[PDB]
Swiss-Prot record, chains C, F:
It comes from Arabidopsis thaliana. This is Protease Do-like 2, chloroplastic. The chain holds residues 110 to 577 of 607 of the full protein. Serine protease that performs the primary cleavage of the photodamaged D1 protein in plant photosystem II. The active site is at 50 (charge relay system), 81 (charge relay system), 159 (charge relay system). Transmembrane segments: none annotated.
From Swiss-Prot, chains D, E:
Transmembrane segments: none annotated. The chain holds residues 110 to 577 of 607 of the full protein. Residues 9-203 are annotated as: Serine protease. It comes from Arabidopsis thaliana. Keywords: Chloroplast, Hydrolase, Membrane, Plastid, Protease, Serine protease, Thylakoid, Transit peptide. The gene is DEGP2. One of its GO terms (biological process) is chloroplast organization. The active site is at residues 50, 81, 159. This is Protease Do-like 2, chloroplastic. It is a peripheral membrane protein.
């Protein structure tokens, strides 16, 4: 899960 | 809950959970 | 004469098979360790619980007797680290002259500890004084009970043998785990509590806690603000939801007396004639279920209340309740309850901040609550994308908040739905297809491979 | 004409004096360091932000010249680790031939990094190829950007010197601190940094979508979400301070971004036949750009528009240069929790709960701070509260604290009998207001201290 | 009546704030510690000097009482590591029964140390015998004194509590920092410390002969020196600031000291049949005592008289509490080299020559200091001299420097064009006086600093 | 074709017997090591000196030839780390096609290093660029000579083989001692200097130094105070008493030009068209005995002077002059000259501050000066009280200041006096009786035990 | 002599002994 | 050698  | 530090071993100074 | 006393001390052989928490369909490697025990009278032997912990078999050897005998573990307190053993028979106990329990020593009282060092066939002895009488912890993070410090170091093999007066009475049980020169002793009083606990209830009910988080009031303005007279009282910062307090106490309460003993600025309280003791001590001398009367200052007003005292409820348990940890596997997704041993075994990383804090900082909101984690995913075509997922807390299943792992297990079995939807802590969501998960069942545990989808306790029916 | 190219590469001498983050009326021990910079044109020197970080003085030295000169730092992007420098001489720039910036290289392309290794003050060179092109992490300041890896290791004194083509164009900026792994900041990042600054006369910073994303590699997962093909990423969370919170919702699946299809992994078409992380797209925009986003919400296709701004950090890495904010109030020293503060004392004495809030919690609103008690300066008034270090403070006299300025204001307006601080544990410290106001001078005329505030906290507060 | 004896033993809570020795306008990070103290009579508490060292506040706590009280440090001998404390309550001393001091024990005598271990705030006890009686080293403050070793290890919180006879007399003071080896400061040392302070209303300190000695164990060596018997020690060196420099000479052999025969090893009769280090005798005198010394000089017997004073240290351990001295002058920070300074930065960045001067060189005159440049605060005026840390400075404008006060004076009187500092290596830094005087405010209004001196350097200077 | 070049490279086998400095009647343990060399023409092989250091025997192996041959060490520069070898014969040299020396490379020039890695029978190659051309040190604390840095790491076994152009010329010799990825190369120019040194003098005369301690003048006020115009010059802080300078230069002199090349604020100086170089470089390109013209500013006045340049005189030597270290033993008191190797071998403590600084901070006051130390005392009835004495510098003997150990040895032999009086650094004095010391001689070295009271060089006659 | 730091390796910054 |  990545913040973009 | 949360915002406690529930074990008297990982806390210190003047905050202690009371009991046996 | 003198050597009669040493004849009451016994060497303890125990084979240990612990469960593996990381993979809890398996057990850890079987080993044998040694320790000490002694005759307390009747047909009973006293020892440390850690000596007989996870006992596959337990054997005891008399001093000056070649033959080993075979012992059974009657009852074991984990947080006070005591265990009783019975022995069979009739030969071992022949001509045995057991030890009597002394009262609690005074500082500087002479003490000798008797036990069997690791290695060798011979008994050993150390002499010193009682250096310290303090409340301490007998099991990691577990509880706080009275304890005696002595001026002499103790060999691991030497717990749980006796600690003696100069009058030959046993004043407690030696305790060593396995840079100090300070030995520890579980005192007679904690021992008595254990024995009467056992006589009354025929099982270990433990040592109660008040269920409360206290702040010392040293500062003048605090005390003035709270309307506390003279120097007395500790401020209640937090209460445990599963304890009878919190129905009784509130944040901002200053406990003042306990069973009509006054409580000071710091936690202490009258103990014996010249001495004071941490408030905790009184609490610990009670039994599970007991009521204590507590003098309180609420708002500005003196008030009396009653509180039921029960043993601490640990959301993330230290003790596992003995036996084997629960697990359930769905679509190769392996679930267990978070426990201290699991953390210990997985070490520091791969656990992670978010989860670690929850284990350190969180309290049970109700009895039976657990943190259920997904430890690993056993790779397979149904779980693709979900592999590489480690130590994640599951919150919801198909919309429903998970209370514990038996609950989760009951929800899986009642599920007729299209998908199995798991919402985790990150807000991460794993979706799986029910029918395909089932077809994969045998194939997954074969290949990995594992005897059963569950641990036995989760076959049992679920309540509420 | 080879030695011509080297002549644009300058050595950078810098003296750093940072703040003590515990008691930020003081400074830490100054140290000097060296690094590299090069001529990009106009009167401008390009280098690494960290090379000039908290600079008390900056000197630059031309190749084959003994004299140092005095450079001033013109602008610093922190998130891309880039800095512009000027020098006033007319020496220096005399007979200068600045570098041209080249385009983004392709793998196996030849590269030479030029800079000044630590010590000896003679220039150095390494040669390698471009091993990797990827979105990578920048200076733990984190904003993720495109980056180049090279087959060659780079000395710490070499960053911020240039990385060259075989055509003699600069393809990026050497970046190293302290493998056989080089890291280069590529021209497009540099370019972005320049056009940002060319407007505004100052560095605004790279924007972000403000969204927390899950790949969908699982067919079951997609069916459930009614995704047509395998494409899209799933929105787990939306930052409140982002424009996206008014537009995107948890559960949405984003599909296209300015009409580029987001893959079911995190990807996106890059150039020609290549694929790059979705983050690349967002990063190539500017603050205030509007992006059009394709989403699947419920089962239905939608189109939304989001304004893009730089991430609002609850716990900042940057500190904005110079002095950080503080209070006192009766020996209790109050500052904002920052990343730089988090390593002075490193990790301990901070504690699990704080550290995690710093790694996880997001701003609920612009300007929110996590305010901590760093320490207590022992004194009669605070007796019983000494020890007491690194504790987030929540309420003051019942009032939730927004940030340290809010806190400075509530205290100025107080007038009440006691000052009551509720901290993280529900631990509470109570002080007598008069006694505190009377002990002020004694405490900081003792301990001893320039003033009872950082200068900014004097300004009138907001809302 | 046992619990009666314990009731005199108190727990000590102390908050230490020391100076930063590099930039001594600042302080290091305060920390709190605990220790022990006991009642010796009058209104006085006895404890370890280090327990109260650089105290911002001191609290004491009676056994079986929850309340802390406020103690003030009355007097501190540093070289014997002893301290007296007072408390104003009339609580506290209410119902007090102070300890009686017993005589010096004999080996195998039973001993119990009583104190408060770190944490738990309950009293503790250990029992052992007296294992050793010897002249030992004190707090690296060094003055060598009589000391007791015990069969028992002692917790750090236990020093400065009492060590007891079986008759219940105090035989000394527990001393521990941080084996199964205890160290006790014996009553005779305590006694010395009290009578010293009882005069003068203050601590003068143990004296020394001021002489550097070689044993003669070699018969050849003795024949050569024409020593009658095997006895005597040989004088290699004499401290200039000692009274002995006017009386004793290199080459002398000292034979008797106040009519006690010094052995050819370093010894001396102790009590009854025991033998103790010569140092014991000197130590049992008081500053200003005159001692009569037997010597063999050339081949001839002589008798001389020497006044005895506390050792004059070129590089001090003590620092005399509170703020150490400093200058600045154009960013160059000047302080005296001290032992406490030598460990902040510990050993490195000091360098071989300095460290050795600190371990060897002796004062040529009272008040001599080794003055160092700790660091340089970068600025236009000092360009080229930054870096430049921990360097002893010798001359200022041609003038040999006596100490930092001398240096403060020469600078105040300067009026010349350049300020010229010659350092240890013959490295020389030259500054323009005007430019320096003009950069002052900017430098300390930047860096940034309370003032350009430590307060003492303002007072008029001497000669 | 290409492989013809690699055929000029040779593998070097060398057996090493070093002396023990701690006990210098003894030698260290004999071992064998490997390295690289190459044919430079004539009958000569080039290598690193450290490859053949303390050579018991030296053997070389051609590439693709099973037989080992046997080589002699013609001459060895220690501070430039170069050695020449000759080989016998007539078979080895058959069909050999030696390497020619290239000129000095430019930054980014392609380089390949050729040599024989430790282990295996096969030759290896690494390619990179010239990363750096700088002045560095070739031997610990010894000297500073030009050097080439390359972009590729080098295997210890690979020095002292050749470093090549892309034109096949050798541009220097590889150097590796035995976290970088940076290889070092002794350049052709330092090599030329060595070869012509050898042709001219038929022995190694080394690389001269100016004998001076310099300070950079960056600061404006310094330069103004010293009356130095523009930006030029370095300030003379100290001069070596054994160097022709100090008869010529004084503290406070600002050297301005050297052989009519101007010297800047920092140490640098015109080198090649776009480049500058540390002043040291010019100094190093001279030969022992050469005169340099030096432009100076003294007071405020420009002045020209001439200076003879000789190799540095090291009070505490790094190199020992090869062979075995001197020693003399009196009454069991063992004396040797202080040297770096001795320090290295005794490590850090037991050396001590006072002595260590002397070794770091001190210069020779005259040619032939040494620091003589008493390393250990071999216990015996004459030396009682003097045992336990370690690493002490001796200053005087019977009143006379000791110049070096040959001097001390000459004084012992000329001594007819009653006592042997040794004054040490502490002002400590050891007195011994002459006649008894002699009687003990045989007994002491028997018992300890040691072949000889001396090392051979101290039997020789003493001069002045 | 003394007060030097004779090796250019144990000194640093702007103090260097000149030569080979 | 001791200082006294």
């Amino acid at each position: 899960x990545x913040w973009x | 809950x949360x915002x406690x530090x529930x074990x008297x071993x990982x806390x210190x100074x003047x905050d202690x959970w009371x009991x046996x | 004469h003198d050597a009669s006393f040493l004849n009451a001390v016994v060497k303890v052989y125990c084979t240990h098979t612990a469960p593996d928490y990381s993979l809890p369909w398996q057990k850890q490697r079987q080993f044998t360790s040694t320790g000490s025990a002694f005759m307390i009278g009747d047909g009973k032997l006293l020892t440390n619980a850690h000596c007989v912990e996870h006992d596959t078999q337990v054997k005891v050897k008399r001093r000056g007797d070649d033959r080993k005998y075979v012992a059974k573990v009657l009852v074991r307190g984990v947080d006070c680290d005591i265990a009783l053993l019975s022995v069979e028979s009739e030969d071992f106990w022949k001509g045995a002259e057991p030890l009597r329990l002394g009262h609690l020593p005074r500082l500087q009282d002479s003490v000798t500890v008797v036990g069997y060092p690791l290695g060798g066939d011979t008994i050993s002895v150390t002499k010193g004084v009682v250096s310290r009488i303090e409340v301490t912890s007998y099991a990691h993070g577990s509880s706080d009970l009275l304890g005696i410090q002595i001026d002499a170091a103790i060999n691991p093999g030497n717990s749980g043998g006796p600690a003696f007066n100069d009058q030959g009475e046993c004043i407690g049980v030696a305790f060593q785990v396995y840079t100090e020169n300070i030995g520890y002793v579980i005192p007679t009083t904690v021992v008595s509590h254990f024995l009467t606990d056992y006589e009354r209830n025929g099982k270990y009910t433990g040592y109660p806690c008040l269920g409360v988080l206290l702040q010392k009031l040293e500062n003048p303005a605090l005390r003035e603000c709270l309307k506390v007279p003279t120097n007395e009282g500790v401020l209640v910062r937090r209460v445990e939801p599963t304890s009878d307090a919190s129905k009784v106490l509130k944040e901002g309460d200053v406990i003042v007396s306990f069973d009509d003993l006054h409580v000071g600025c710091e936690g202490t309280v009258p103990f014996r004639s010249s001495e004071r003791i941490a408030f905790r001590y009184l609490i610990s001398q009670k039994f599970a279920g007991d009521i204590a009367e507590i003098g309180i200052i609420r708002a500005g007003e003196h008030k009396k209340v009653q509180v039921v005292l029960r043993p601490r409820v640990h959301l993330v348990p230290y003790h596992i309740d003995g036996g084997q940890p629960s697990y359930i596997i769905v679509a190769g997704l392996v679930f267990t309850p978070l426990s201290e041993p699991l953390i210990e075994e997985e070490c520091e990383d791969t656990i992670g901040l978010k989860l670690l804090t929850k284990a350190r900082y969180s309290v049970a909101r109700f009895r039976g609550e657990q943190i259920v984690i997904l430890s690993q995913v056993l790779a397979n075509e149904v779980n693709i994308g979900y592999e590489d997922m480690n130590n994640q807390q599951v919150l919801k299943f198909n919309g429903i908040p998970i209370r514990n792992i038996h609950h989760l297990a009951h929800l899986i079995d009642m599920c007729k739905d299209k998908y199995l939807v798991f919402e985790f802590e990150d807000n991460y969501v794993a979706v799986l297809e029910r029918e395909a998960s089932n077809s994969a069942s045998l194939c997954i545990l074969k290949d990995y491979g594992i005897p059963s989808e569950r641990s036995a306790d989760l076959l049992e029916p679920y309540v509420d």
